Enzyme design. Structure first.
Site, PDB file in Angstrom:
ATOM      1  N   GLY A   1       5.954 -13.293   8.978  1.00 33.77           N
ATOM      2  CA  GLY A   1       6.164 -12.713  10.291  1.00 33.77           C
ATOM      3  C   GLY A   1       5.214 -11.568  10.607  1.00 33.77           C
ATOM      4  O   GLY A   1       4.633 -11.006   9.683  1.00 33.77           O
TER       5      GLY A   1
ATOM      6  N   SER B   1       9.774 -10.550   1.060  1.00 34.42           N
ATOM      7  CA  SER B   1       8.806 -11.033   2.043  1.00 34.42           C
ATOM      8  C   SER B   1       8.183 -12.366   1.641  1.00 34.42           C
ATOM      9  O   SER B   1       7.755 -12.533   0.498  1.00 34.42           O
ATOM     10  CB  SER B   1       7.705  -9.989   2.243  1.00 34.42           C
ATOM     11  OG  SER B   1       6.803 -10.430   3.249  1.00 34.42           O
TER      12      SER B   1
ATOM     13  N   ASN C   1      10.147  -5.764   3.763  1.00 33.05           N
ATOM     14  CA  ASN C   1      11.126  -6.771   3.362  1.00 33.05           C
ATOM     15  C   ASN C   1      11.096  -6.997   1.855  1.00 33.05           C
ATOM     16  O   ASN C   1      10.075  -7.375   1.284  1.00 33.05           O
ATOM     17  CB  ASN C   1      10.869  -8.077   4.115  1.00 33.05           C
ATOM     18  CG  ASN C   1      11.788  -9.194   3.669  1.00 33.05           C
ATOM     19  OD1 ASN C   1      12.744  -8.985   2.919  1.00 33.05           O
ATOM     20  ND2 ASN C   1      11.509 -10.407   4.129  1.00 33.05           N
TER      21      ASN C   1
ATOM     22  N   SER D   1       8.318  -9.329  10.363  1.00 31.97           N
ATOM     23  CA  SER D   1       8.655  -9.256   8.954  1.00 31.97           C
ATOM     24  C   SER D   1      10.042  -8.671   8.703  1.00 31.97           C
ATOM     25  O   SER D   1      10.339  -7.565   9.169  1.00 31.97           O
ATOM     26  CB  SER D   1       7.626  -8.387   8.218  1.00 31.97           C
ATOM     27  OG  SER D   1       8.019  -8.298   6.849  1.00 31.97           O
TER      28      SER D   1
HETATM   29 MG    MG Z   1      10.315 -14.793   4.999  1.00 31.53          MG
END
Ligand code: MG
Length: 692
Positions: free
Chosen positions: A456, A235, A232, A180
């Protein structure tokens, strides 16, 4: 040729800076160096030392403080000649070892060179800042150019796949790995921009009507599909396989988006400091005071689905601005003005639904004292408030063949309300994707290049069913690298009898994969499914059953001694503890039918389609029961993996520099952990000791 003009932006931003007369002198020195650990405890913290003497089986080197140390030549991590520092392909390194490989990525990274080749594949270290290397100017440079002819770039591996598609006449795939936040989605958007440009039409009108629409599909899906997590700020909370399609001539004939595993629980729950999907904050911030009035909106802090995490803003992002972007993208794609306002009707509707406050009645059953949010939602959805009310607290079910009206307590009613919301959002997302695909599906393809952009590998303090499915997917993708790089490769060598000694690269996630999706003996998803259709099953009988099958029996499983509700899975990227709370209901993914009968009657043309379209509202049946999320996902994945196998795969290993989303801060522990579990050095090794 900007390539050869040392003053171009190409040399400036994609090439290593000329060394000076003092670097030349260091570069021609005859001294020899070794990478060592000042603190043996800290095996990833290295310092450079000079080799001062040698025996037949050892080196003696000087540390930085001044001390002298002996090491066996067999355990020595020699430093490469510093003329290798910054080299564009690390297969060229004489000493292939962990500090050497990291060091080279460091040197390049220190000058904003985020791409580096690692034999057959590309490595990309997230810079967490902008670098001007994706202009049309940069795009044009890489055109037709061979890998060894230009600097490492994502544009370049894109090109290579294109040529391979034209020359071999074989479908291709771009597989971008990463945990991620590592950069998969950014690079993903790059592959497509480059394929769209070098392959887009070029004389009037279509030329980047399609191409531009292909482009405008991503911002649509990111607003609805992406959110701020602790790892993130953007994300991807859904996975996607993008088909970029071409004709026999090599021009873009179209593109197809397959979506995977949207995190619909995000809509109703967010951990501290995270956000709901971007679209919620974009609307409330970007709507006109007028629409604000029609949709009964008000501030994020006024909605239960938005005021729990303590975060409604992302630093450096303007939601009201992204709102404009989403809208323009929907216009390009072709979302009618009526459709667009239905979409935000659903978004505002979801928000009012979340504001409903259930209370305990005289009985243990629930009541709705304030109908304000109920009426507002009903109002924007185009559904009868009292039907919706009954559907929520008094749903009707079959008891045998009898028709019994239930009366859920507070808890149950809230969960049902949450189920509605999640079905609405997930069906919407599926609908947006369906609609996009019609637009970009206008011609039978001859070939394609597929770009895989998944969610991820991630670890949170609390890991639930969503994270298992995410990390299992990441585990299969890594195994797909292993398979192709080491297994399929040597299988040839032995096949084509070139003599040839099989090598074991120690990379194999099969035991972990099997533990999760195994059918016989049954793995975690299978036991889950069993329990899921067992009338007396609880979250507690589920974990007990998991422990009973795997504890002290599977090497990749752990029953923790510190908790009775969690189990550990040892993945390639590390051990993850999963909390069993709610997995049965998550897997079953239930929705009261009265709820659906209440929305199937809505007056809104978009909502109606979310509950009448068999392709959106219907569910496959695994006999007596509906298929589970687990069985369904396992099936959608296997199909994706089967498709990948019929392509020429190109790997991009995305790498996160730190766990802070900060530029200019490359931490060895973080980076080296990734290099190891990704199999990067082994990847360079197979390339070097082999016959590509
Ligand atoms: Mg992404």
């Amino acid at each position: 040729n900007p390539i050869h003009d040392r003053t171009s932006d190409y040399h400036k931003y994609l090439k290593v800076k000329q060394g000076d007369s003092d670097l030349f002198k260091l570069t021609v020195s005859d001294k020899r160096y070794i990478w060592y650990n000042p603190d043996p405890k800290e095996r990833d913290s290295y310092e450079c030392g000079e080799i001062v003497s040698e025996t037949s089986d050892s080196f003696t080197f000087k540390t930085v403080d001044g001390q002298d140390r002996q090491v066996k030549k067999d355990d020595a991590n020699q430093r490469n000649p510093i003329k290798f520092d910054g080299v564009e392909d690390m297969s060229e390194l004489s000493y292939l070892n962990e500090p050497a490989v990291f060091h080279n990525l460091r040197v390049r990274y220190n000058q904003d060179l985020i791409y580096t080749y690692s034999g057959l594949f590309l490595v990309a270290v997230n810079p967490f800042k902008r670098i001007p290397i994706y202009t049309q100017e940069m795009v044009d440079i890489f055109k037709g150019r061979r890998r060894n002819e230009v600097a490492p770039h994502i544009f370049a591996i894109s090109d290579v796949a294109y040529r391979s598609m034209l020359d071999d006449r074989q479908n291709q795939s771009l597989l971008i790995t990463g945990e991620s936040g590592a950069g998969k989605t950014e690079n993903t958007k790059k592959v497509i921009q480059y394929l769209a440009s070098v392959a887009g039409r070029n004389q009037a009108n279509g030329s980047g009507v399609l191409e531009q629409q292909i482009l405008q599909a991503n911002p649509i899906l990111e607003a609805f599909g992406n959110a701020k997590t602790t790892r993130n700020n953007n994300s991807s909370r859904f996975g996607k396989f993008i088909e970029i399609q071409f004709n026999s001539a090599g021009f873009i004939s179209g593109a197809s988006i397959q979506s995977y595993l949207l995190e619909k629980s995000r809509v109703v729950f967010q951990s501290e400091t995270e956000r709901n999907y971007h679209i919620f904050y974009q609307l409330l911030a970007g709507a006109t005071a007028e629409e604000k009035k029609a949709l009964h909106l008000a501030g994020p802090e006024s909605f239960n689905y938005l005021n729990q995490s303590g975060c409604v803003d992302i630093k450096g992002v303007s939601d009201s601005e992204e709102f404009k972007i989403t809208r323009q993208a929907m216009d390009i794609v072709g979302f009618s003005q009526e459709e667009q306002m239905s979409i935000f009707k659903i978004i505002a509707g979801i928000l009012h639904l979340g504001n409903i406050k259930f209370e305990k009645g005289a009985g243990e059953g629930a009541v709705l004292k304030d109908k304000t949010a109920l009426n507002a939602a009903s109002t924007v959805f185009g559904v009868n408030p009292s039907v919706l009310e009954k559907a929520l607290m008094e749903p009707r079910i079959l008891a045998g063949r009898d028709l019994v009206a239930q009366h859920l307590n507070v808890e149950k009613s809230s969960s049902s309300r949450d189920a509605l919301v999640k079905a609405l959002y997930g069906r919407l997302f599926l609908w947006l994707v369906k609609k996009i695909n019609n637009v970009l599906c206008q011609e039978r393809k001859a070939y394609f290049i597929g770009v895989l952009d998944i969610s991820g590998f991630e670890i949170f303090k609390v890991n639930s069913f969503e994270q298992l499915c995410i990390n299992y997917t990441n585990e299969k993708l890594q195994q797909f690298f292993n398979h192709h790089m080491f297994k399929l490769e040597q299988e040839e060598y032995l096949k084509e009898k070139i003599n040839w000694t099989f090598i074991d690269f120690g990379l194999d996630s099969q035991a972990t994969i099997d533990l999760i999706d195994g059918r016989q003996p049954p793995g975690i998803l299978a036991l889950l499914d069993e329990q899921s259709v067992f009338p007396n099953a609880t979250d507690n009988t589920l974990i007990t059953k998991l422990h009973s099958h795997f504890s002290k029996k599977n090497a990749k499983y752990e029953e923790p001694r510190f908790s009775k509700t969690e189990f550990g899975v040892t993945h390639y990227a590390g051990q993850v503890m999963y909390e069993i709370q709610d997995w049965l209901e998550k897997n079953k993914d239930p929705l009261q039918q009265d709820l659906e009968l209440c929305f199937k009657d809505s007056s809104d043309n978009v909502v109606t389609k979310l509950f009448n379209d068999p392709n959106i509202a219907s569910r496959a049946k695994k006999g007596a029961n509906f298929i589970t999320v687990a069985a369904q996902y396992k099936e959608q994945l296997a199909s994706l993996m089967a498709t990948l196998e019929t392509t020429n795969p190109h790997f991009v290993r995305c790498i996160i520099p730190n766990n802070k989303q900060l530029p200019a801060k490359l931490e060895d522990k973080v980076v080296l952990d990734q290099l190891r579990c990704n199999g990067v050095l082994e990847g360079i090794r197979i390339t070097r000791k082999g016959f590509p």
